[PDB]
Write a protein that binds this DNA or RNA. Structure first.
Lengths: 848, 81, 49, 71
RNA sequence: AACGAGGAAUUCCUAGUAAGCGCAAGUCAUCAGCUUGCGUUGAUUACGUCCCUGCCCUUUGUACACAC
């Protein structure tokens, strides 16, 4: 067998996380899948990647998709990059040592926000569920967990060490206390959720769902109801859409990023900047107090609208700097694996330019959209073909690209070995041939088809070509020297989705729009055979290198291996729980790699049809697959722009109360003799006392008082076990238990909580142990029972006076209503019949 | 009145009856009482409470009877010694 | 019998959860861990009946 | 598996006494010139004196001293 | 030559029982290298406990009161 492991992943420039910025012409750290990407803004190419030695398919990764780096945050003092992953695990990365050192996990969901301060060296994490967990990097223990939200965490701010402010994915905002571990105030923000939170020390800004921000002011007011956090202003006009992340920097500008390609920048002002504006508003109020209340209902006092920034791809992450307080520079990561650098000049008054400057762009190494098809040359030269038109030429030994072109709505690509030319298939009915040494648009045949083409293949010579389309046609093409021409077009019954030419150059299989695979003789077009029984249109057709067996699979998640000689089958194998997309063959052995929509690439054998290897490189869809013609490395093209290349290699009741009785009363007799010490110390002479005998560490860890710690063991003993575990206690502990009740009687609050339980327990011990308790002479026992009988009777009479008052008091309330509201009846036998009908009736099961 | 609806719920069991009996006594001693004489309309609901209290009155008075076993224990020990 | 002139039942309004032991929950104050516990308590009780 | 001394029921004291005195007769006249009638008279008379030469008295103080070694 | 009441390790057994003793029959299966009945003699030691090893049940009291 073999063990193939992935070498690297490419086109992973910007994943779904917030980036961070490094000073120096700055540097930028973005997110990758199971990695993070770090480069220069100036050059753009990678300088390092942060991962351990874990490839999927090896002993490290198991049967699950890898954790996407869904958040990262870096501090420039310790050079620690705290990354949040998709399964709630928390990793921290040394930048110079490129190694993870601590690996916590406390969340069951993906980590949304991370904010960590090196001033106390603490790490605060926020996930997609409610829990905010604060770790410390010096003790590696989850110190205090903040759990009061209901939906999620999306806002985040830590203010030293007494408060914490967070917003959830339902429109409500919390403030907690450090010391008291609980919340203080909650306040709803919007009807929908409040995504973004940016904080300056005076104002808190929170966006909503319908292009609405709320400007809130914090205070250190100790009032119970209000004044902790107020809601004076609402500003509008971001877009029609709403923001997700808001961030602010000083010399006094802040920005909000939407989901509709729109970053909006607004300027906040200060005291005299708004106080002169207040006089300007007072000049507006003069031109009763209608305008003054309209100046209190307002947002031009703080929010000065600077400008908006319109991108073309969906804006994902943004962090921004400023240089010399005149040029604010904004870094952007798009939906695609592309980086935008936006620089805006200002003189603290004017936007100074209509559009932001694109001084730095990273586009030449990503994928820019979803990649659709792959090409592998004979000497390991890769090509990638995407949807919007990025045909990129990659080399494995560099792990980089050479150049990229523009090629329309391209779908498929086949590589001609002769001259190293690339045949390209667009969704438009046209063909393209692109060269390496010369230019690209030499001879691109327009109007070759009407509808969308879906499959291309070629002969082993390369001079003959086939184009399968949804025009219910397949067209044969030949190259005459320097242009392609059509040779033979066959109409068919349905749309054609997958075409493969045989490596023996004798067969040409066609996947129709039905569940039919019809294979023709390549020499003659003579309708050799048809296959049927897939229940869905077939997406991938393969035949072996020696041309004995056909391997096909459709969207109904099964591989139905056929026989090329007779049209029989060998194995119908269900796998790949979403839908099977593509099948590729090893060029020397009967082995087929299946890539599918559920992010799994499986390697099977053609002689046992069991899973020999299972690959879990990523989590999104796998669009195409490719296998090298001589070596055997497998290239997988993903939906999230990933190119993975796989190079091959005890106690009992009664006893529990006894230890409770022995521990507490030795502590009780400990404090009793100590109380007699200070009565003999600080009264007569001086006398250096015992200086507080220490309580037990078992007592002080839970911090239960010794009367209480004995007491709840009585509740923990069950009701039928108590009568038999109370006679296992001998008379020496009986004298202790009488001393225990005489000490818990001094706290009347503790007695009345479980007074009938104490009454049942005490008057069973003394009832059973009566002969020893009476015929043992002790003045202390005479005093202790005298204290406990007079106090238990007084406590029982106190709770019996309340019961008997409520019985007699509310019987009066009943009988007063029964003469006031009740209209009584004179007719005695008719009244007693009516009361029997008006009385309560209940049904019970009986036996006659 | 809504507290008295919740007070009837707490009186149903035999552990929370001390809180339930204190709250009804709070209505008739600690509150504004002549105002509470004025207001009708709840008196059907308050009548469903009372035979639970008479069970709890008879149980507690039986516990007073079991508390005089100590009075026998103190007298007989004093007589013997 | 006094338990037959009132046997305590389930809550008259969906925002509360009454129980047989006389105590009563309310939905909008309960923690999600305890609400999941009371979900599991009512699930195995209804599976018994 | 430590030995722990426990006290003994009066019925068990009778049952162990009769079992040890009979075996003391049977083991003494195992292969000897004396028969069972002679040695049971020798075992019972020595047991009544507590003269520590019968098998039954020799097990009485041995089982106690084993129990006396760890109370 | 083996053999002086039988090693480790295992199995069974609570009263007309274990154990010992003879007599009779040979029942459409099974049994003569034995099987099945019928009598005589007739004990020790638990008859409690869930501590260990197992095996099962229960964890809304719903079967009507009281108690809990």
């Amino acid at each position: 067998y073999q063990r193939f492991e992935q070498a690297a992943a490419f086109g992973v420039i910007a994943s779904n996380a917030n980036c961070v910025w490094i000073p120096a012409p700055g540097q930028l750290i973005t997110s990758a899948l199971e990695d993070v990407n770090i480069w220069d803004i100036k050059t753009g190419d990678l300088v390092s990647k942060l991962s351990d030695g874990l490839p999927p398919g090896a002993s490290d990764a198991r049967g699950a998709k890898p954790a996407e780096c869904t958040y990262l945050e870096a501090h420039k003092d310790t050079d620690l990059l705290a990354v949040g992953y998709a399964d709630g695990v928390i990793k921290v990365w040394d930048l110079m040592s490129k190694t993870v050192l601590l690996n916590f996990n406390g969340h069951k969901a993906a980590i949304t926000l991370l904010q960590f301060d090196g001033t106390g060296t603490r790490l605060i994490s926020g996930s997609k569920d409610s829990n905010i967990i604060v770790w410390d990097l010096v003790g590696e223990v989850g110190l205090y967990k903040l759990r009061s939200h209901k939906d999620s965490i999306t806002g985040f701010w830590c203010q030293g060490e007494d408060w914490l402010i967070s917003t959830s994915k339902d429109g409500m905002i919390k403030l907690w206390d450090l010391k008291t571990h609980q919340c203080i105030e909650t306040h709803i923000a919007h009807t929908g959720e409040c995504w973004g939170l940016a904080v300056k020390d005076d104002l808190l800004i929170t966006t909503g769902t319908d292009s609405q921000v709320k400007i809130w002011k914090l205070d250190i007011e100790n009032d119970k109801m209000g004044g902790k956090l107020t809601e004076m202003g609402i500003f509008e006009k971001q877009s029609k859409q709403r923001g997700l992340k808001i961030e602010f920097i000083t010399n006094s500008f802040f920005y909000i990023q939407n989901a509709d390609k729109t970053i909006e920048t607004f300027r906040i002002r200060x005291x005299x900047x708004x106080x002169x504006x207040x006089x300007x508003x007072x000049x507006x109020x003069x031109x009763x107090x209608x305008x003054x209340x309209x100046x209190x209902x307002y947002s031009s006092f703080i929010l000065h609208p600077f400008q908006t920034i319109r991108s073309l791809y969906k804006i994902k992450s943004a962090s921004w700097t400023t240089v010399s307080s005149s040029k604010l520079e904004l870094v952007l990561t798009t939906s695609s694996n592309t980086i935008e650098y936006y620089s805006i000049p200002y003189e603290k008054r004017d936007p100074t330019s209509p559009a932001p400057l694109k001084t730095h762009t990273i586009e030449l190494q990503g994928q820019r959209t979803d990649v659709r098809s792959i090409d592998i040359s004979d000497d390991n030269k890769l090509l990638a073909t995407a949807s919007n038109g990025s045909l990129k030429i990659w080399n494995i030994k560099t792990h980089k690209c050479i150049r990229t072109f523009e090629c329309g709505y391209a779908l498929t690509c086949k590589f001609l070995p002769g001259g190293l030319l690339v045949i390209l298939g667009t969704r438009n009915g046209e063909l393209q041939l692109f060269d390496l040494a010369s230019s690209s648009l030499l001879d691109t045949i327009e109007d070759a088809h009407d509808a969308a083409i879906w499959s291309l293949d070629l002969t082993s010579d390369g001079k003959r070509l086939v184009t399968g389309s949804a025009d219910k046609t397949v067209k044969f093409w030949d190259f005459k020297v320097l242009k392609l021409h059509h040779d033979t077009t066959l109409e068919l019954t349905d749309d054609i989705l997958c075409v493969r030419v045989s490596p023996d150059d004798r067969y040409l299989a066609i996947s129709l729009l039905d569940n039919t695979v019809k294979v023709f003789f390549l020499d003659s077009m003579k309708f050799y055979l048809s296959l049927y029984g897939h229940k869905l249109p077939v997406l991938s057709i393969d035949i072996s290198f020696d041309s004995k067996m056909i391997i096909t699979s459709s969207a109904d998640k099964n591989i139905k291996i056929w026989g090329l000689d007779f049209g029989d089958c060998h194995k119908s194998l269900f796998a790949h729980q979403d839908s099977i997309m593509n099948v590729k063959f090893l060029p020397q052995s009967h082995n087929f790699f299946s890539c599918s929509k559920d992010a799994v690439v499986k390697y099977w054998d053609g002689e046992k049809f069991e899973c020999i290897q299972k690959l879990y490189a990523h989590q999104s869809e796998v669009w195409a697959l490719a296998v090298a013609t001589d070596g055997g490395f497998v290239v997988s093209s993903s939906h999230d722009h990933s190119i993975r290349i796989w190079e091959e290699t005890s106690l009992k009741a009664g006893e529990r109360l006894m230890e409770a009785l022995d521990l507490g009363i030795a502590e009780i007799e400990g404090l009793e003799a100590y109380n007699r010490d200070m009565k003999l110390x600080x009264x007569x002479x001086x006398x250096x006392x015992x200086x507080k005998p220490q309580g037990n560490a078992v007592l002080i860890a839970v911090n239960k008082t010794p009367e209480q710690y004995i007491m709840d063991t009585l509740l923990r003993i069950r009701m039928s076990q108590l009568e038999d575990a109370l006679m296992v206690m001998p008379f020496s502990y009986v004298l202790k238990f009488l001393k225990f009740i005489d000490t818990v009687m001094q706290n009347k609050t503790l007695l009345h909580s479980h007074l009938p339980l104490i009454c049942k327990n005490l008057f069973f011990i003394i009832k059973f142990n009566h002969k020893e308790l009476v015929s043992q002479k002790n003045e202390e026992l005479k005093l202790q029972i005298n204290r406990v009988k007079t106090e238990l009777r007084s406590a029982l009479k106190s709770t019996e006076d309340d019961l008997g008052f409520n019985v007699q008091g509310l019987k009066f309330v009943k009988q007063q209503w029964n003469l006031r509201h009740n209209y009584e009846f004179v007719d005695e036998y008719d009244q007693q019949e009516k009361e029997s009908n008006s009385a309560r009736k209940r049904v019970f099961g009986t036996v006659i | 009145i809504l507290l008295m609806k919740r007070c009837r719920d707490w009186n149903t069991n035999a552990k929370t009856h001390t809180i339930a009996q204190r709250t009804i006594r709070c209505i008739l001693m600690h509150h504004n009482i002549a105002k509470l004489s004025e207001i009708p309309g709840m008196v059907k609901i308050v009548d469903a409470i009372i035979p639970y209290t008479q069970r709890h009155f008879t149980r507690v008075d039986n516990l007073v009877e079991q508390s005089y076993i100590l009075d026998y224990a103190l007298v007989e020990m004093d007589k013997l010694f | 019998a006094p338990q037959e002139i009132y046997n305590v039942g389930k809550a008259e309004k969906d925002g509360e959860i009454r129980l047989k032991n006389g105590v009563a929950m309310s939905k909008e104050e309960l923690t999600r861990e305890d609400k999941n516990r009371l979900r599991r308590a009512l699930k195995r009780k209804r599976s018994k009946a | 598996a430590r030995r722990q001394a426990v006290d003994v029921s009066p019925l068990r004291r009778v049952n162990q006494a009769i079992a040890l005195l009979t075996i003391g007769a049977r083991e003494a006249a195992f292969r000897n010139i004396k028969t069972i009638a002679e040695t049971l008279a020798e075992e019972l008379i020595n047991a009544a004196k507590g003269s520590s030469t019968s098998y039954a008295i020799k097990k009485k103080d041995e089982l106690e001293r084993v129990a006396k070694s760890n109370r």
